[PDB]
Amino acid sequence: GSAIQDYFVKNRVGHSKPWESGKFKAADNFPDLSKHNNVMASQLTKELYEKYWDKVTPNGVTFDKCIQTGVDNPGNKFYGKKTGCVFGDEYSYECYKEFFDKCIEEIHHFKPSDKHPAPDLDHNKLVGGVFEDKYVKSCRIRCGRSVKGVCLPPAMSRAERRLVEKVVSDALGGLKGDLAGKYYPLTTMNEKDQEQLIEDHFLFEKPTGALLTTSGCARDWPDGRGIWHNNEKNFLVWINEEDHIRVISMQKGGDLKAVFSRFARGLLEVERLMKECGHGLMHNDRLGYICTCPTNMGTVVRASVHLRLAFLEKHPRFDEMLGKLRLGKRGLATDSTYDISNWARLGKSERELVQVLVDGVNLLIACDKKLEAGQSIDDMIPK
C-alpha cells in the first residue's frame, strides 16, 4: 500500500528530465561553473556529473535538485565561500557519495574514511559550566535535527511538512517540568501572541535569503511552520524553519552548565517521545545527524558564550590561541565582546564540544585577568 511513494519516486521535482527524454548527453546539461565560488563548483566534475545526473533517490530527489542552489548562487570572489548544495532527503548523501565526500572534506576537513562518534548528551558528565556573569554575559546552545523517513525542506511536500509539524509538536506536547511549554503554529497566529513572540525574540519569518529560497525552503509558507517555547522561556524550538527541527537552549549569565542540562534533557526526551510513535531523528552512521545544508551534520551543535575580554583582545596571540583551542570568534569591538563557540561539528560528541567550549573559556578568562594584573600569558598558551 504505497501508491503515493511510487508517484514521487518519479515526480517530486516537477521539472523536465533531460536524460530520459530520448537524447541529450550529460555534457549538454552540465552547468557552467567558471564564475562560481562555492564548495559545489570546486568539487563538481563532468565525470561526477555524468555518474549522478540520471541517478534518483527513492524519494525522487535528483542531483540537479541537490546542486541547484550552488548553480544559482555563484557568490562573490570577495564574500565567504558558501557550500553551494543541499541534501534533498536521507538518501541523498549515500546516493551522491562520490561528490558529497569531496564537499564534506573541504567544509569540515573530514575524510571519507573518518567516523563521527555516537551521540553523547549525558549532561552529568560535563565538568564546569559556571562562569562569572562579568566575563560571560549570555550563552546558548543550538542545533538542527531532521525527522527520519521524511524529505528535507528542499524537496518536501506540504503533506510531509504537515506530518513533521504534527509529529514534533505532539512530541513537545509531552515534555514536562522545567521543559513544559506551548505551541504556536504560524498559520493560526493571532497578533495577540505574535506581539509577545516578537518581544521575546522567538519569532521567525519567511526566509528571503538567496540560499533558503533557491533551495526551495520557503515553499507553501507559513504552512507546517511553528514555534514552541517552554514556560521558563529559556528553551525554544522552531519547526520547518530551515530544518525540520531547530532547538535552542539559551539564557543570560555565565551558567553554560544549566544551558546544556536543559538542552540535553529536552532533545533526549523529544527523541524519546518521537520514538513512542514510531518516528526518529534522521541519522547517518558516518556523518552523525543530517540537515539540509552539508555544514550542519555530525552533532550539528553550536555552543557559544558572549565573552568579554578587554585585555586579551589586544594580545597578538589572541587568535592563534582561539584557534588552538578549536574555537571560533564572531562579533575589534570597543566593548571587547565576542561570540565564541566550538568550530568543530563532526568528529566529537555533543558534550565533548560543549566541554571544548567550557575548557576554552576557562583559559580565556584566566588570561584576561592575568593580562590585567600585568602578568604574562605566554606559558598559558596551549602549545
Annotated binding site for ATP: 138-142, 201, 246, 302-306, 330-331
302-335 CB burial, b ≥16 within 10 A, e <16: bbbbbbbbebbbebeebeebbeebbbbbeeeeee
CA dihedral (115, 119, 123, 128) in degrees, to 10, reads 10
For a second copy, the closer of residues 7 and 323 by Cβ is 7
Residue 342's Cβ-count burial label (10 Å; 0-12, 13-18, 19+) is buried
- Per-residue contact string for residues 45-74; x = within reach of a second copy by CB under 8 A: -----------------------x--xx--
Cα distance between residue 342 and residue 331, in whole Å: 15
Q: Which parts of 119-158 interact with a second copy (CB under 8 A)?
A: 149, 157-158
Shortest distance (Å) from residue 219 CB to a second copy: 6
Q: Which parts of 24-43 interact with a second copy (CB under 8 A)?
A: 24, 28-32
Do residues 212 and 199 touch, judged by C-beta distance below 8 A?
A: no
Shortest distance (Å) from residue 43 CB to a second copy: 19
Is 376 one of the binding residues for a second copy (CB under 8 A)? no
Do residues 370 and 135 touch, judged by C-beta distance below 8 A?
A: no
Bond prior to 222 in cis (omega within 30° of 0)? yes
Three-state secondary structure call for residue 203:
coil
For a second copy, the closer of residues 27 and 333 by Cβ is 27
Closest C-alpha among 361, 344, 235, 266 to residue 300: 344
Q: Which residues are annotated as a binding site for ADP?
A: 138, 140, 142, 246, 302, 304, 330
Half-sphere exposure of 352 (CA within 13 A, CB side): 16
User: How many residues of this chain interact with a second copy, rule: CB under 8 A?
Assistant: 36
For a second copy, the closer of residues 149 and 174 by Cβ is 149
CA dihedral (90, 91, 97, 99) in degrees, to 10, reads -80
Q: Which parts of 198-217 interact with a second copy (CB under 8 A)?
A: 213
For a second copy, the closer of residues 15 and 314 by Cβ is 15
Which member of 223, 255, 271, 339 binds a second copy (CB under 8 A)?
223
Shortest distance (Å) from residue 101 CB to a second copy: 25
Which member of 105, 220, 269, 339 binds a second copy (CB under 8 A)?
220
Pairing of strands 130-131, 254-255: antiparallel
Q: In the complex, which residues of this chain contact a second copy (CB under 8 A)? A: 1-5, 7, 10-11, 14-18, 21, 24, 28-32, 68, 71-72, 149, 157-159, 162-163, 187, 213, 218-221, 223
